[PDB]
Design brief:
hydrolase/hydrolase inhibitor; Thrombin, subunit H; homodimer; six-stranded mixed β-sheet; binds ligand T6V; about 25% strand; 3C-like proteinase nsp5 (chains A, B); 13 strands
């Protein structure tokens, strides 16, 4: 019993974290097979970052300008290419610690673990979601760029995020591992505001299901609702609209707890309209939206 | 910027997690050098757990009754001893992945990362504190025992906790790695209630310092207080009394933010007496007490 905000073990990803230096700039890189992936702004000064032309800046760079250090041993760079907003550095040695891995572009609402790294040395690990405004609420200082987001399916590391920007509001933007940014963000120090940070309605329902299971049941009510009725309340409270797809995904938890998805929606509705009244659900004073249905099932069944 | 509940990388500890089977019982073990550490209740059925005499139960066991599996390779057991509430299984092979390590008995209020394991396979990792009632608020199912708590100082893993019991209230009890339980708990399925779960006042102040730094400042006030005055409020609200030692420890954060420890105490006092008024500090609707002063400094300076 007990429900915690829980990250995948980072061991498999600690073994891929290297230091990438280009001139004065030193951020983190991901060494998989004979390729090291890092943010392309490694080639930039903080002065370049106001309006960089990466194609032009890159012409001036050579294989030998990119210094890749894995622990206290340097890797020889035998090729470099720009894909979108990441560089791919081909090294002469394949990473002996390369796990099974895929690159996956995640959807908003999806969760992943982040290994925070400075100088290719991991500092800590926490769990995150891709917000519906394509930001993430991270913890990232200077030198934390090229830190990666991942999920783990038994032995296979699916990489979903590489860290790039901190918006003036202190929320975080970044790319998949094909270097395509999540949302309309660009590796440029410009006016970049995030849209409405809406609550991930399905994840809140999952997390309510997790509470019931883990003993916290005060918030169960006699009422039910419809999708259309519940959504009018969701809209008002800047909650993501709930679809039949979201309901289907909550079926397992529905079945396990024998509480209908729409009964639990009616529970949430009342929590939105009436608040918590100074009470707590799973040691939290607000409605947590960074646990997927899949995250609850996993933690409540104990998958390794 | 941004402040997250952050665990140490678990890589160094993933490499010490093995499966320990004795008869039908299979929990997790910690393989360091040529010794595998596990909870002594591995020798028990769930029927033994009502009133076990471990000395007597252990006489019936031999080196060959203890089956230790590291991945898909079995380790040969050449000796076994009981220390307090843990078994130490001497194996013929030393763990090639043994990091630098110490065993440390932590104090209440101190934080540590937990790698949750089932069948010696890590499932996830989260950050915890030793509560002032010598419980921890974990996430642990059946087979999660012998999961370990640790801190990491650069390369040295200090192990502070091995998981043993879930109290009828769904909070968790366990030992240091010398097998001595935190608090008055015993590896016996008996009436065991936790005492008053008080709030770790120093950690709340640290976490308030973390907020100020990270942009959240609404809760700063014009008022200051004394230690004796603040403590009368702490007592009322079941908060741990603040000492000159706690103040001294908050000096670095005091100095960095140029907010006096007693000014910040006056800030907290008002939050206790007036609540948050539907507002949030670092994305949390209540006062978080599972970040040490040291945890804030580390995350706000980016130690690896
Ligand atoms: C993204 C990041 O953390 N860094 C950065 C800053 C400007 C341009 C590229 C990368 C830091 C990486 C190391 S640093 O101290 O040079 C700045
Ligand atoms: C502590 C724990 O998780 N387990 C346990 C239960 C009873 C006695 C000793 C250990 C589980 C370990 C594997 S299990 O399924 O046999 C029970």
């Amino acid at each position: 019993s007990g429900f915690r905000k829980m990250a995948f073990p980072s061991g498999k990803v600690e073994g891929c974290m290297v230091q990438v230096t280009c001139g004065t700039t030193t951020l983190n890189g991901l060494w998989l097979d004979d390729v090291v992936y890092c943010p392309r702004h490694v080639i930039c000064t903080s002065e370049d970052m106001l309006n960089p032309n990466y194609e032009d800046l890159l012409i001036r760079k050579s294989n030998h300008n990119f210094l890749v250090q894995a622990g206290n041993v340097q890797l020889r760079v035998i090729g470099h290419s720009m894909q979108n907003c990441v560089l791919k550095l081909k090294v002469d040695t394949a990473n002996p610690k390369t796990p099974k891995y895929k690159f996956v572009r995640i959807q908003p609402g999806q969760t992943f673990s982040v290994l925070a790294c400075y100088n290719g040395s991991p500092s800590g690990v926490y769990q995150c979601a891709m917000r519906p405004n394509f930001t993430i609420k991270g913890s990232f200082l200077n030198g934390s760029c090229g830190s990666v987001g991942f999920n783990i399916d038994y032995d296979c590391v699916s990489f979903c995020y590489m860290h790039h920007m901190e918006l003036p509001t202190g929320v975080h933007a970044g790319t998949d591992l094909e270097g395509n940014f999540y949302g309309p963000f660009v590796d440029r120090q410009t006016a970049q505001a995030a849209g409405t940070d809406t609550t991930i309605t399905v994840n809140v329902l999952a997390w309510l299901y997790a509470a019931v299971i883990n003993g916290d049941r005060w918030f169960l009510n006699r009422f039910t609702t419809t999708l259309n009725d519940f959504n009018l309340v969701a809209m008002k409270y800047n909650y993501e609209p709930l679809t039949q797809d979201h309901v289907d995904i909550l079926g397992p938890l529905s079945a396990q707890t024998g509480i209908a998805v729409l009964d639990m929606c009616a529970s949430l509705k009342e929590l939105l309209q009436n608040g918590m009244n100074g009470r707590t659900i799973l040691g939290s004073a607000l409605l947590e939206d960074e646990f997927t249905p899949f995250d609850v099932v996993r933690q409540c069944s104990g998958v390794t």
